[PDB]
């Protein structure tokens, strides 16, 4: 099928071509590794120019015909959710592993043995990391919170928000606390909604304990706010999914009035339906009517006369958020609405951010809730995007830190320690295992060298000094000058990376290397 | 033959011969083709000796009659 314009490689150039393609893909974001990584210009087909050093963003927006590169990019897309901030490091490590595998194959080693040896080396490196890891939560709660805030600030400082990034870190920590419990120590990002718009400043960030529902209340005369009514039991919400209109035909409609009899009959039917719905709403005791669909003119008029602000076109996920925040339930229809299923919230009011005149509607609880929304604003679209990315990274880092008390330190110190351990263990295992361990150690050496290169330091001398310091004197956390630092020994600089994060990075790099190596034949057809 | 792309008008004579064999008889589709091909091949040897086509045809007809009687 589609034999014409079909290309394939197998037996001679498959391995070399795949490894070269992987190296070329890696070189796209290799220079962007680290906080001071060089930026790349990304331009949309419409001509919108953007600047960012995020490896995940760079790879996601890149399309290509190479099969190995496409597979690597697709795997990175899935890994972005698992870690997020480690995509570039994982890609670089996989590229280094493939480069070493090239030499190993040139020496006569079968790919399966290379993959098995890399897996064993990854296991040994993870064991070494676990042995050398330190516990923060088991030392002091104050120190644990300080390290959480420090990680959030470090993530935020790489963007424009660095001027006032403290507020973003505090909001992220509060959202994680509200949404995550210690039973599982996992943050449910589905309950942490990310929303924002162009305008305002970085100081307009706000954490909401419920859904936003920035709606216009349908009818122009419909009140735009639901007040607590001077100390009353908050605001009662009618969670409904049935549209606030009587059944209508789907074929003709055109229910026009031609005489008195037809007018009377149609008015009787429609008014009876609307009165039934509005009476059910009133009996339920709800103060605000929320429907998954829109509202009819008669329904809007009746709600306005009864002082019942309306919310139109609320999505299913929004309804679930309403139920979670207000401890309510979703009522399929008006006839099933009762006071026992209405949700309660502190208030539904309009909130202004900076100079914004939209006056968006927000549902606020002011109490601890299982679902929150992270609101992000900024003077430019780039500011908002960077703030959202930094908030996501901070949330992931906090989740990783809380999930596992064991942590490692950045700047390549963990990579250097793993490389030293793997090199030491290599001489103990005979056969192809020795070559595999040496290759894995050399690949691990790539990350600190790349970081040093990105920081303007000599990778050779920097790596040699790091190895000497970590071997001759003692095992510690010594890395490269990723940022402006007085000296080395990140341990005193408080550059901490979660242990689970590093373990996931290593495992994903090994898996990607195996996936690329295990493909010995590629076939691609033509295009129409 | 029903599917092969045949454009030379001379081959169509043997194609029609095969069609006649299939229509009238229930077998011998390959036999007629083989026999016609061999007859035309030996006609090359006959011509190489300087024999005219008319006498070759006359001899073929006489041999055909004799063979049919002997069958």
């Amino acid at each position: 099928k589609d034999q014409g314009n079909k290309k394939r490689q197998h037996g001679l150039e498959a391995k070399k071509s795949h490894i070269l393609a992987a190296r070329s893909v890696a070189s796209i974001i290799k220079t962007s590794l680290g906080p001071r990584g060089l930026d790349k210009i990304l331009i949309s087909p419409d001509g919108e120019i953007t600047i960012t050093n995020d490896g995940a963003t760079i790879l996601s927006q890149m399309e290509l015909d190479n099969e190995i590169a496409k597979l690597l990019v697709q795997l990175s897309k899935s890994q972005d959710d698992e870690i997020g901030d480690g995509t570039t490091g994982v890609v670089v490590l996989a590229s280094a592993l493939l480069d070493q595998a090239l030499e190993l194959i040139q020496k006569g080693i079968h790919p399966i043995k290379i993959a098995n040896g890399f897996d064993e080396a990854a296991k040994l490196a993870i064991s070494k990391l676990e042995e050398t890891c330190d516990d923060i939560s088991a030392s002091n709660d104050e120190l644990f919170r300080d390290f959480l805030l420090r990680a959030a600030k470090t993530s935020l400082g790489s963007k424009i928000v660095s001027k006032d990034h403290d507020r973003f870190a505090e909001m992220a920590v509060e959202a994680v606390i509200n949404v995550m419990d210690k039973d599982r120590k996992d943050v449910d990002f589905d309950l942490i909604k990310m929303q924002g718009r162009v305008g305002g400043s970085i100081s307009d960030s706000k954490l909401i304990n419920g859904v936003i529902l920035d709606k216009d209340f349908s009818h122009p005369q419909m009140p735009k706010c639901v007040l607590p009514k001077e100390g009353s039991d908050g605001v009662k919400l009618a969670i409904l999914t049935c549209p606030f209109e009587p059944p209508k035909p789907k074929t003709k409609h055109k229910l026009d009035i031609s005489s008195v009899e037809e007018y009377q009959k149609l008015q009787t039917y429609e008014q009876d339906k609307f009165k039934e719905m509005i009476d059910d709403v009133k009996k339920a005791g709800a103060d605000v009517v929320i429907c998954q669909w829109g509202f009819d003119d008669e329904a809007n008029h009746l709600l306005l006369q009864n002082d019942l602000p309306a919310v139109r076109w609320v999505g299913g996920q929004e309804l679930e958020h309403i139920a979670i925040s207000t401890n309510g339930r979703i009522v399929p229809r008006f006839q099933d609405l009762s006071k026992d299923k209405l949700g309660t919230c502190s208030r539904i009011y309009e909130q202004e951010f900076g100079t914004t005149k939209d006056r968006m509607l927000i549902i606020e609880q002011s109490k601890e809730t299982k679902t929150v929304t992270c609101f992000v604003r900024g003077s430019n679209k780039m500011i908002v995007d960077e703030a959202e990315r930094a908030l996501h990274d901070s949330l992931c880092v906090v989740r990783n830190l809380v999930k596992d008390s064991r942590v490692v330190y950045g700047g390549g110190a963990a990579e250097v320690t793993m490389s030293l351990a793997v090199s030491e263990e290599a001489d103990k295992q005979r056969g192809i295992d020795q070559y595999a361990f040496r290759g894995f150690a050399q690949a691990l050496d790539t990350i600190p060298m790349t970081l040093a290169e990105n920081s303007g330091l000599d990778p050779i001398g920097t790596l040699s000094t790091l190895k000497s310091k970590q071997l001759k004197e003692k095992i510690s956390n010594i890395g490269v000058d990723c940022l402006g630092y007085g000296s080395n020994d990140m341990k005193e600089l408080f550059v901490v990376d979660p242990f689970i994060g590093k373990k996931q990075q290593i495992l994903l790099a090994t898996q990607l290397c195996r996936m690329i190596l295990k493909i010995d034949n590629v076939i691609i057809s033509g295009k129409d | 033959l029903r599917e092969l792309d045949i454009v030379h008008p001379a081959v169509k004579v043997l194609v029609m011969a095969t069609e006649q064999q299939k229509i009238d008889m229930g077998d011998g589709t390959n036999l007629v083709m083989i026999l016609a091909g061999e007859l035309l091949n030996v006609s090359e040897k006959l011509i190489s000796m300087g024999l005219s086509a008319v006498e070759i045809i006359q001899g073929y007809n006489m041999a055909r009659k004799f063979t049919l009687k002997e069958l």
Binding site: Q3, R8, L71, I112, I519, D520, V522, I523 | V7
Partner: protein
Amino acid sequence: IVVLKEGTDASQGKGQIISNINACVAVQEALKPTLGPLGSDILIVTSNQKTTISNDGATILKLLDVVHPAAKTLVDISRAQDAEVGDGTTSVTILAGELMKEAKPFLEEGISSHLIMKGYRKAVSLAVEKINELAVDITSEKSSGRELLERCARTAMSSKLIHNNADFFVKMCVDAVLSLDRNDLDDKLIGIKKIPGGAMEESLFINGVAFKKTFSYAGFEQQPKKFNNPKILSLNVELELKAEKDNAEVRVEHVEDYQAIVDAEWQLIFEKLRQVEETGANIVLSKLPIGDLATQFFADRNIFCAGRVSADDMNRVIQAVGGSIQSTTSDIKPEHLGTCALFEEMQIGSERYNLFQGCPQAKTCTLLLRGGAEQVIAEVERSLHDAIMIVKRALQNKLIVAGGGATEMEVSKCLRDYSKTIAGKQQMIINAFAKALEVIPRQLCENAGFDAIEILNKLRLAHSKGEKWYGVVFETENIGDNFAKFVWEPALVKINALNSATEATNLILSVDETITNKG
């Protein structure tokens, strides 16, 4: 005025056969890395830019669909093998490619394809005979359709908690698969229940289905605990003094009217309970709770009842007893009643457990496990699940031959021996077929990273003496008796694969010219 070939002609004879051989070689090289569990994957991009990475031969063949007529024939034969059998597609393709490779030198030397095909057919006949001879079906050698399953279960439970006690659990595992339809095996039909108390060696095998206590209303231990002629009937929504389903809220302002209505409902329930007895239902089961009134009536009528039965347990019990589920008591029919030899409640574990035994016609069974702690019983359950899976796989194909190339090595050795007694031109074809049969172990070793030449030489040297089950060990690079290691493949699958490969070889080698019409 219409031309189909566009004035393009093609040659015929040995040239087209050699071209077909080359196409088959290309296909074989393409599918080579996917042979064996340790083989490499192939990445294929379709015309729609969809990227798929897979190792299954059928998927690769479907995605590629090489237009070459010989490759088309190979793909068709592979698809036929997959549809008819589902196993050996890659092996069939590899064997066909190897046979086509071997046929090339014979054609180059002027050997007619008819002789090659006849020799291949004779080699196939000899290989089938030798595989049938090698096929293991023994009774007196301490192995059989049941003893072999016990050995497989013991091997599966090796290095486990119950390894020392496997002598008893192997019988349970084998009977579990043998207690139901032997031609239709399913793991879901073998249930396991954990009962604390007692030694692991005291576990009981139940022919029918058993479940823990589910009844907790009045009348417990007041009904018969043993039935010799039980009648299992699952009634959905009755068993109450007040209707549970399709009911309504009734508000009455007068005590007398409410009492009269309640009395009428109670009389209706009385009539329904009497009908339950009239239907001959000795065992009453339901997924919903059973009221005190129904239990009291059944106890007074020597009828057993148990509600709050889980859906899976109820379904398994119904399937084992051959009964059905009835919506109402008035609609109960005799054909919906199931019967077992003996139904009783087991007191093991300081609690009563319901079980049905002596029902060889049951479609499902349940295993009762005993032990001093729940963790021990859980480990026993895991080991039993592993053993059940292994014995089910073994029983699905009781006719087995040594795997890991042992069967191929034996067939090749037998063909080589025969070639010394088939004096004539057929000797070359027999030797070629024997050599081709050795491709499977060669490619398996190559894909596994082993030294193919050394492993093949050692296997050939070893197979000349001793057992016929010597093969390649894929756990640690070596050779040995795979049968002793419980590694084997179905004989019928191998025979079908060889037949399909030879059929493809004969079909492709039997074509002298191909003509394509524009369309």
